[PDB]
């Protein structure tokens, strides 16, 4: 039960950061441009059992485009991403959508406006209407604040499984094992712990 | 007569608090978020053993699952008055048992101090 | 008139 | 081993290729990743296109053939005109041949739609290069081949669809203006023959796959073709009847009719009006009989999400709203059309009940169009009485939380219109709704919140007497509801809604003091309630009511011994005792709003003194024991107390602005002394602990004090009315307190807020402190530039504030840059260009503006030595740096301001605004105009930067560009044409004669 998902959009819009959040829970602050594509399995637990997304995270920068629309072949769903703090990234949404649906003529597609955490929003909500005639689902999201970060995958899961009542559920929590660390690593872990303590936690002004 | 038409429920919640969990990447000398959500101290009714179980909001995916070992020790982080750092020798949130250096941060110094209190209460439970 | 009664009524609102 | 296909010295092993491709698409993990890198390297080989015919013939893998066509695509769109003409004919014949043989094999045609669509797109790229000038028979032969095979005919519809898209929908960015017009005229010139085929296929049946492909292409045609093709043929009849019956064709047909509704049409022809009525009438008829009746529960249908029902209902909403927004007047006068008009709107009512945010926004936009018209247009509103009545309930029941923000305001606007259209009906629905909250038949947290927002949203629509009766009934009923419910959870919700409604009806509060007073005293009681959210709600309602009713707090009310603001201040310690610091600040801010209404200065200052009594006493205490033992400032508690005192001053200053000055004067000098003391401790801590100290709670606490002090000063100066005092009392102490400290701290200890504060100082009083501005530059310019000129990432805040500061200095005190030593002025120029290269929008825009403002500043100086030297040193630096970001494809967001700057620079030369020669007396003959030299410099610059351009292209580009330097829209067009041509080889230099 796995589905191929292609993720497309301008460079720097937060596609890779978004998937990373879902994969590990981290927020990557640095911009390391994706080269061609990176494939990542992503599993969600639902009341209909587990659903697996094979996420094809593609490059948005043209000089790193790689196979470009060749990545779209046999995709069963997609996310188009833009940046609400950058108008040009919204202006290019019709171009990504075009290259996408030429290869994938009938698939569920979600349009995501990322970075709504940033105060100075440039692409106003009322300007965002492209999805209407193209029957795309639309979500304001933020990989940084996790605002609606789960919505795209939930909507897609529902379309792909054919159950509008599908819900994410809590995976089973097995009993964890007991501890018996040998003294031969007592000085080793104490080294790694001293570095950890003296390295400041990030974003100390956040609510959590 | 007419005919008509998780895996934690064998446990007790001792403590619950909202928090953000970090793992230390020693190879990058960098703290990385592992999840934000409710952190719970769960007491097994059949063993009286207490564990930390924490899930991410919305996705409900497990980001922490380990015994509150008596040997563990909560230390402060240099940049925070509402966080604790400690070494975990076996966490099973992501598959097999793996060791981690965790940090966990809270809404206030108060919630952090209370956590440390509960954490140590739970430790002496796992002694008995 | 009925507004003074409304004010009196508003004062009686409490949590416990 | 997979890397064999990258060895071009040997033949290409097709079997090895198919393996690499299979491993990428169907494989996983490390192998997949490796294959991916190989395929990209293969594809990016500039000779790979030569091995494309091999793959397309001898491969058994469709993905491999797809990749082959992608390789060909790059070649056709970028290097086509460079090839020997035989290769061009060869590639063309091969693609045409490959498409034909795929269509003739029914097996391949059925099972390889992806590969065929790619081939079609590739064919279209060739057409854009070769057609019609070198392929005049393409369309005639296409139409011919169509009659001999249903598969070829269908595929030709896909080819034409893609062609229309490439020529009319996606040409603006991808080809020059001249090339785009050429292809548009060419298509337009032969469309008569294209439409004939299209219409014959639609009329004669019968393969739905062929019908659907033909209708898909029609949808594209409707974007540009003249209306006569639609209205002077029978095609509307076919669309609105025949094709609405089959679900296969229904979806695309509906999309076509939506676009038909947007056609350019003459508005004085009665026959055409009948045609526009008729297809609507036919369409709605087919929906009622073939899809669902107007009574159907569309909410439920949409929720069930069977098949394509959601898309269909979305498309129906778009059709109905698009047509009715343009044409509903056609249906409003004829009595025989009334049922049609109201049925169409009843479908929209039903569509508006669907739980789908984005679709609701679409219908809501239409409703706004309607009720606005009914509010202004005579004799219309009675027509829609029953529609509007239903709409009131729909909007009331789907009201969203006020303060997304955008959807609430749109809902409010429609509901306010609907209330004007019938106040009595609106009131009745809301009271009825409220009763079903009391009898519990519709009671929930969501339903009471929604109703309350709705009731709050129509404030101002009723008469004051009707509003009075209404407000009384609602609050009375809501109060009863609050008492009815048990548990703080339920009571909290109802209490919040009650406070929300009263806060929305200030007119009522203003007319009834005793009640307003009761409301406020009640809020003060709630400020002691520890239940989650209550205190926040109490404070937010307090300041909100104050903003609207402040006048009634400052004047002495009848039957009162004093203005109520005095009563609030007297008891302020008690009132705020249980509040958190943030909430106390809000309370004090609210008090500042009231105090500023008092325009007796003596009284206003007294009130201000009394309000600030508690923070000032705490302040005086700390200042005493702070200067006694500076170690206290390491006590986290003292640091927090101090921050909160300053924050209280910021809160009140935010409200009082100019009026806050006497209070500022009370603390000002000791505050700046505190700033210095704190600064020393931060420095001492960093010295003793290292940079890591800046991350510690202690130092972050200390820096908060500094930041709040700077915020306070910034907040006052930005609002000050007496600038003499700002200059003569505030500025010198401020600069002496902050500038040297900033300069002499290590980068990680410098507060970006200093820059922000200085920007405000220069903005308001810069023109009055030229020596001060020079002092600012000296202390922050070089050391800040060195922080931010090694990459684009570090010190993001310093980066942004830095260019804001330079911007305002360049605007308000340009004299300060004139005083800079030549080396420092050079860094200034370097800094501006560095700003150009940022992707960061904050930095980029200011960078371009500074550049533009700087040129203008230099221009205004006239023919003087500094202006002459500036052009000699930096003119071509600005020209070439601006060209670089224009053409590098990584700064497209700045295109307009780059264009503007470039146009300004070029115009200076062609207006002889630059007196001295820009060249060396050696490198060009004596008496040569700067105009001639500019064209030479630019031709050489572009030739070296873009060596694949012909001299002729460059010369034609520059000729056009310079001659158009008084016409920004045209100029910009020529730049866009240039950006297209640099992406390929052999661009037509005559394109630049387009304008
Ligand atoms: N404030 C904010 N920043 C974000 C958000 N999402 C991503 N970013 C940041 O945007 C930058 C680019 O992120 P990235 O995932 O690499 O974008 P991308 O779409 O994958 N780029 P590419 O197509 O070139 O691979 C990063 O610095 C990232 O931290 C967000 O939601 N909010
Ligand atoms: Cl909705
Ligand atoms: Mg990426
Ligand atoms: Zn056609």
Author numbering:
A (entry chain A): 9 to 216
B (entry chain B): 64 to 68, 78 to 200
C (entry chain D): 5 to 20
D (entry chain C): 0 to 376, 414 to 439, 461 to 1052
Question: What does the original paper state about this entry?
Answer:
The exportin CRM1 (Chromosome Region Maintenance 1 protein; also known as exportin 1 or XPO1) is the most prominent nuclear export receptor in the cell. CRM1 recognizes its protein cargos through 8–15 residue long nuclear export signals (NESs) in the proteins. The NES-binding groove of CRM1, which is wide at one end and narrow at the other end, consists of 5 hydrophobic pockets P0–P4 and is virtually identical in all CRM1-NES structures. The resulting CRM1* construct, with ScCRM1 residues 1–1058, Δ377–413, V441D and groove residues 537DLTVK541 mutated to GLCEQ (to mimic human CRM1), binds NES peptides in the presence of RanGTP and RanBP1.
